[PDB]
Amino acid sequence: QAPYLSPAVPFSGTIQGGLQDGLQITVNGTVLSSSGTRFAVNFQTGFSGNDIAFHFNPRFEDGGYVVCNTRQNGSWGPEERKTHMPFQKGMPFDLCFLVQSSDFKVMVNGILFVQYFHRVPFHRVDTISVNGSVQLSYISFQ
Ligand SMILES: CC(=O)N[C@@H]1[C@@H](O)[C@H](O[C@@H]2O[C@H](CO)[C@H](O)[C@H](O[C@@H]3O[C@H](CO)[C@@H](O[C@@H]4O[C@H](CO)[C@H](O)[C@H](O)[C@H]4O)[C@H](O)[C@H]3NC(C)=O)[C@H]2O)[C@@H](CO)O[C@H]1O
């Protein structure tokens, strides 16, 4: 799949073939300095946002933490919070998601940050969305 270059936020975009085991999705961009305190990358089924298999949600709030969660039929599940903030307001980042059989692995700036065990079947994910306090340079697929 060809990369999305400079896509405007809020973005959604199709993932050709959907998520498969071993797929790596790179989101390269910049956290805005003064344009809010949260952003999210969502791996979801379709364009509606009611079914998000993996919501990855850094929050520059309450000391800095990242929320990982799943939305199913419009309902959010129990949050998994990583109380580390690997991003910095105003700074560029490279975020890479590795789809594995049991979990997503998430690397930030070349370092494994968190894993998230699948709560719903990943093959059903065919869409990536990004919203919030970020500007995107590219989203690429291998
Ligand atoms: C202590 C505790 O449990 N705290 C709870 C809060 O964490 C919780 O806040 C919600 O948490 C979930 C994750 O669990 C999400 O981050 C909710 O944020 C919403 O996220 C969605 C998906 O990114 C986003 O919807 C998208 O918006 C874009 C436009 O930007 C477009 O419309 C898309 O189609 C759509 O999917 C939505 O805007 C966003 N809202 C906010 C306010 O950030 C987050 O609210 C709350 C409420 O569930 O419960 C506390 O108890």
Q: Is 78 annotated as a binding residue?
A: yes
Range of the domain at 1: 1-142
CA–centroid distance, 39 to ligand 1, in Å, is 10
Please identify which residue in the block is written with the tokens 């890479």: 96
Cβ atoms 45, 125 nearer than 8 A = yes
CA–centroid distance, 134 to ligand 1, in Å, is 16
| Distance in angstroms (rounded) separating the CA atoms of residues 30 and 120 | 30
Q: Is 77 annotated as a binding residue?
A: yes
The overall longest dimension of the chain from CA atoms, in Å, is 38
Give the residue whose CA is nearest to atom 30 of ligand 1: 131
Give the residue whose CA is nearest to atom 25 of ligand 1: 49
Give the residue whose CA is nearest to atom 13 of ligand 1: 69
Q: What is the CATH number of the domain that holds 67?
A: 2.60.120.200
Determination technique for this entry: X-ray
CA dihedral 62, 68, 71, 72 (to 10 degrees): -140
SS (H, E, C) the chain: CCCEECCCCCEEEECCCCCCCCCEEEEEEEECCCCCCEEEEEEECCCCCCCEEEEEEEECCCCCEEEEEEEECCEECCCEEECCCCCCCCCEEEEEEEECCCEEEEEECCEEEEEEECCCCHHHCCEEEEEECEEEEEEEEC
Cβ atoms 54, 70 nearer than 8 A = yes
CA–centroid distance, 46 to ligand 1, in Å, is 17
CB atoms within 10 A of CB 91: 10
In single-letter form, the type of residue at position 60 comes to: F
For residue 10 the two structure tokens come to: 């809020």
| Distance in angstroms (rounded) separating the CA atoms of residues 140 and 142 | 7
Q: Is 61 annotated as a binding residue?
A: no
CB atoms within 10 A of CB 130: 24
Q: Is 59 annotated as a binding residue?
A: yes
CA–centroid distance, 7 to ligand 1, in Å, is 21
For residue 16, what are the contacts with CB-CB under 8 A and spacing of at least 6? 1, 141
| Domain count along the chain | 1
